[PDB]
């Protein structure tokens, strides 16, 4: 959605329509500041979302002892060491696709062979 | 030190003998905000000290990007004599230092 | 008047 915030008082901006040019403007409900929009998208609702599958990946993820190790090949550096974990989404509708993190380049790939 | 509010009667002309506007003359003065370690802050913030003696020197590389503090030999060889002043924020904005003292109450 | 007896915390 790319939420936009006001520049003068840091308040939340809202979309407004100007008929003088039939364009899109973002205006502040408190300090009367205007800004031209960059994209025509203002609202986004996601019934089925894949955001958060790899949440929690950090620069020191490999230091975790509990995380299992694997021998899969990383298709960006040709390495064999890596740690894998399932999706972090707790909804009971997600597949068991694995997510692999390489300890040499921090590249995240998937074992999915259906859609990828 | 309670006093009237709006003061439409102009009572501050005789109650106070000094201007009530904050002195905006010394604001053009660079100041470094430094957080000190526990061992150093415990002996530099004491009011039974700070008589004006030279506590050390600051050394800045000609090209910058590295600052260091060198204390004098008055520490009794009990604490480090060299410290690395790390600039956590090269640019500091919206921060100012203001003083506070009471006003003369007569005339 | 007052209660002539009170406690200060």
């Amino acid at each position: 959605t790319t939420f936009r915030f006001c520049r003068d008082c840091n308040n939340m901006l809202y979309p407004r329509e100007d008929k003088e040019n039939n364009r899109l403007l973002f205006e502040c409900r408190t300090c009367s500041y205007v800004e031209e929009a960059g994209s025509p998208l203002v609202y986004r609702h996601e019934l089925i979302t894949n955001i958060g599958e790899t949440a929690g990946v950090v620069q020191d993820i490999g230091s975790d002892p509990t995380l299992p190790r694997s021998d899969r090949e990383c298709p960006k550096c040709h390495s064999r060491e890596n740690v894998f974990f399932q999706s972090q989404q707790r909804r009971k509708d997600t597949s068991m696709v694995l997510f692999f993190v390489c300890l040499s380049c921090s590249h995240i790939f998937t074992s999915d062979q259906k859609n990828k | 030190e309670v006093f009237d509010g709006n003061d439409i009667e102009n009572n501050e002309t005789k109650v106070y003998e000094e201007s009530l506007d904050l002195d905006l003359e010394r604001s053009n003065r660079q100041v470094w905000l430094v957080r000190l370690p526990m061992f150093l802050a415990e002996k530099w913030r004491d009011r039974n000290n700070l008589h004006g003696q030279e506590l050390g020197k600051i050394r800045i590389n000609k090209d910058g990007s590295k600052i260091t503090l060198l204390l004098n030999e008055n520490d009794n060889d009990s604490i480090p004599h060299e410290y690395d002043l790390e600039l956590t924020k090269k640019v500091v904005e919206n921060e100012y230092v203001f003083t506070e003292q009471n006003l003369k109450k007569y005339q | 008047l007052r209660r002539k007896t009170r406690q200060l915390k």
């Binding site: 707790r90 | - | 002539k4 007896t5 406690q7």
Partner: protein, 49 residues
């Protein structure tokens, strides 16, 4: 994130004789202090020793 599990033993605490007596003693001492003040107030008002 998953909802916090109420049965997780890491979120449970065991109160032994130490902590159990501490709260009991705190309550009783609070009552003792209140009684002390009442005697002080009564002596002043009733003019006793």
């Amino acid at each position: 994130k998953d909802q916090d599990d109420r049965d997780h033993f890491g979120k449970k605490r065991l109160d032994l004789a130490g902590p159990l007596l501490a709260q009991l003693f705190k309550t009783l001492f609070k009552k003792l202090t209140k009684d002390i003040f009442r005697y002080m107030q009564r002596t002043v008002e009733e003019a006793h020793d």
